[PDB]
Structure formats: C-alpha cells, structure tokens
C-alpha cells in the first residue's frame, strides 16, 4: 500500500525563482546596459535590469568626489562633481523619502510602493517636454540609510582603458564599505522586488543542484580567496553578468562562501536548491554585501511530503529523499544524518536515482 512516486519534482521551485537571475533580472549585473534607447535620432544604451543591485556604486579613478553628487554645471570643473542629476532646484534630485511620500500623497497607487520602489518610480518618471525620449529614462541610486533618492544624469558605469586612465574621468562599478547602503536601480526594477529579487544572504546554506530527491554539490566552480562574506560578495559581483553585446543576466552571478576555510566558490549555472551547511553562506552579485538570513527553511521537505500524503488505498510518497522527519522519508535502509545540518536532516542514499549531473552542472535524466 506504499510505493515511491515516478514523478521527480523539486520542492525548491518557488523558493529559487528569485535566484534565476537570467529570468528575473534579465540583464547585466556588474555593468547593466540591457536596453537601447534613441533620443531625437541619437542612439544610446541604458540599464534595464529588473532587480535592484544592493551595495553597488561607481568608483572614479583619480578623483575624490562621490559619484552621487551632481554633474559639473556652468563654472564647475568636470573632475569636480559626480554622476547625479543637476541639483539646481533640489526638486528633481536628490529627493528624501519624506519628500517623495509628500509629493505623491494623493497618488494612492504610489503610496503603496516600498521605499526603493517609490524612489525608482520617481526617477524613471521624468521626461522633458519637447523631446523624443523614447524609453530613455534615468536610473537611480537609493540610499537606505540616508533615506535619499538620487537620479543619475550619466547611465555609463565603466569607462576604463589605456586612453581614459593613462597619463581623464575614469570610473568602474565596484562594491566597498561606502556603497553598502546603496541600491542601484534601473528604470525597469520590479516594484515587487521584495518577493521576486534577491537581497539578503542565506546563512547556514550553500547553493546546490537538485538531482531527483536531494540537493547535491555543484561540481564545476571557481575557488577564490575571501577573508569574509563581503569580499565574496565583491568577487562574485566583479565576475557577474556584464554588458560591457547584451548579457541578459548570464554570467558568474552566484557564489558559495565557506566561512570556515574562508573560500569563495563562484559558478555560472542557476541554482535549483539549497544545501544546509552550517559553514557556508549563499550569496549573489545582487545580494547585500553583509545582511545574512540564518533561518533555513527546515520544514520545506516535511511540509511537501505531508501535503501529498494528505491529498491521498495506497500512499504514493514523493521523490523527496531528505527531511527533518526521519520516518517521512520511508527509506528502505537507514537514512544518513548530516552533522553540519542545522535542520538535522536525514538523507536516504540506497535509492535508484532517476537523474544525474554531468558535464557543466547540467542535470539530465538517464532513462525515460
């Protein structure tokens, strides 16, 4: 009256959707130039990513001015001033959260947006009259600690090279202590990014691949030295998808940080599950450089197993060979306990796996 189902499902499907950067972000991360825009017969390239980039900023070589300060205007020096919109009225930019909620106190549909979404909606909703501006909209940078919204006059992010940085306004995107509270936002960032896009890091976890009923280690990765989580977040960011043709979000966007060995393992294949390891933190190029969420979804397997058994003479157990409830797995042999598991998971290995990982982190079925 009990058998194992033939349908190989992954209970991490909905959880991992926000980490499908190619699908949810769909543009470059390090250098975002996903959309092209023409303005009065003048081609441009502008960011287009749909997810925020936490901790990102622009570093100007041979300069000591934050890229968030306005561009030089009139009788200022070019080297002086930054990338932000000219603050001549202090009404277009910068704009504090209080001023944003006040200017839109009557727009009901906007007073329901979160702080970051409100700043994004404000910045992208600017078009000078009498001009074509066909999808040419400015990006923004929201400072969550200062509660300030900054519009960017310049959409460029990197202009390095032998000409510009040699004996000339050189800049490059990067993450450092000064930017940790900033949120880089293109004109397309989802207003519901809180549920669809990555932010906080996943503690006691590391990205893995769901073969059939268990989350396995990702074979192909690149190991790098990382003294702490911040550097691993900086390393993955510098190797992430870059549009400097369009990347559409493809690139080394994910990384597992071994806090004990102090190593940073990056990879370019989208993850499909998490492995509960007390020594690892799962980070992405879009994630915050320091925020960590230690709560691992322990009941994810038990909840799904019990759900199917409740929907059903015989009981068809799902193809989930891992759970914090040892009985629910119904292993023919003795399940194996994981010492480094915060959830005290048990895995059943004496099972015919219907899937297999080979080549470049690809999961394929052996026989249908």
């Amino acid at each position: 009256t009990v058998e194992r189902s033939t349908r190989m499902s992954n209970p991490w499907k909905a959880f991992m959707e926000k980490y499908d950067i190619e699908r949810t972000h769909s543009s470059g991360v390090r250098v975002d130039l996903g959309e092209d825009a023409e303005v009065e017969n003048a081609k441009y390239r502008i960011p287009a990513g749909r997810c925020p980039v936490f901790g990102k900023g622009i570093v100007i070589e041979n300069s000591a001015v934050s890229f968030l300060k306005p561009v030089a205007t009139g009788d200022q020096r070019l080297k002086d001033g930054g990338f932000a919109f000219p603050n001549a009225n202090d009404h277009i930019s910068p704009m504090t959260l209080e001023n944003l909620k006040a200017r839109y106190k009557d727009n009901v549909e906007m007073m329901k947006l979160n702080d970051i979404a409100l700043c994004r909606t404000h910045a992208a909703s600017f078009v000078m009259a009498g001009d074509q501006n066909s999808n040419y909209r400015h990006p923004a940078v929201y400072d969550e600690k200062e509660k300030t919204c900054h519009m960017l006059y310049l959409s460029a992010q990197e202009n390095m090279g032998p000409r510009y940085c040699s004996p000339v306004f050189c800049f490059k995107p990067d993450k450092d202590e000064s930017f940790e509270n900033l949120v880089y936002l293109s004109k397309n960032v989802r207003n519901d990014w809180d549920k669809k896009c990555p932010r906080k890091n996943l503690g006691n976890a590391k990205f893995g691949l769901w073969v059939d009923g268990n989350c396995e280690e990702i074979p192909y990765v690149k190991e790098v030295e990382a003294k702490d989580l911040r550097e691993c977040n900086r390393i993955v960011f510098e190797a992430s998808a870059s549009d400097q043709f369009k990347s559409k979000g493809r690139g080394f966007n994910w990384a597992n940080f071994d806090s004990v060995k102090k190593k940073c393992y990056i990879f370019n294949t989208k993850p499909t599950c998490l492995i509960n390891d007390k020594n690892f933190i799962a980070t992405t190029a879009l994630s915050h450089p320091r925020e960590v969420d230690l709560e691992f979804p322990c009941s994810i397997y038990k909840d799904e197993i019990e759900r199917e058994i409740k929907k059903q003479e015989r009981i068809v157990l799902p193809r989930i060979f891992i759970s914090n409830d040892k009985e629910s797995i119904k292993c023919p042999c003795e399940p194996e306990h994981i010492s480094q598991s915060t959830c005290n998971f048990y895995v059943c290995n004496c099972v015919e796996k219907r899937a297999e990982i080979k080549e470049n982190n690809q999961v394929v079925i052996k026989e249908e």
Binding site: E40, G74, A88
Partner: protein
Amino acid sequence: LQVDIVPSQGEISVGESKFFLCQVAGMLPTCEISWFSPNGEKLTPNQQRISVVWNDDSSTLTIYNANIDDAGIYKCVVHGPQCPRLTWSLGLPEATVNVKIFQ
C-alpha cells in the same frame, strides 16, 4: 543634454547661402545656446551677413552670401550656470560644423 548640428557638413559655394540648425535634446532649466565663429567670436543676432536666430530650444546659423573668408568650423555650445557641462554620452556640451567654400 545632447546637441547636434543638422546639416552636419556644408558644401557651400561663393555667393550661395546655407543654414545650419543646432538643436539640443534634454534642455535643463538654465541652459542656453550660443554660436561661435572659427575665430572664436560669439555670434549675436546681428543684422549682418553671418547672423544667428533664436528659435525655441534651437538656434539657426544663417550664412548669407558666402565668401572664401567665411570657411572654417563653427561651434554651437550649450552653456549655463546650472546647465550640465557634459553630455549624456560623457561628451562636451557642444557641436561643430565644418563649412567649406568652393569657386
């Protein structure tokens, strides 16, 4: 704030007349257009051979009755106190047109 000259080049002949439009996309509050001759003289709307016209966010350069001494590169600069001194494309807020006379 970008600026462009249309036509981009000038194939003028002696005696003929040619007009050049300087249009600025993205004009911000304190921006204004100014033309400059090859020698660097600011062209004011004078009732002379080579004059300038103010038309909305644009400014037209009219070269009536051309002569060989008029050839050169003319500059259209968008300047202003609160006006960006850099283009969206990290370029100077100016545009040039090279007019060449013949016979």
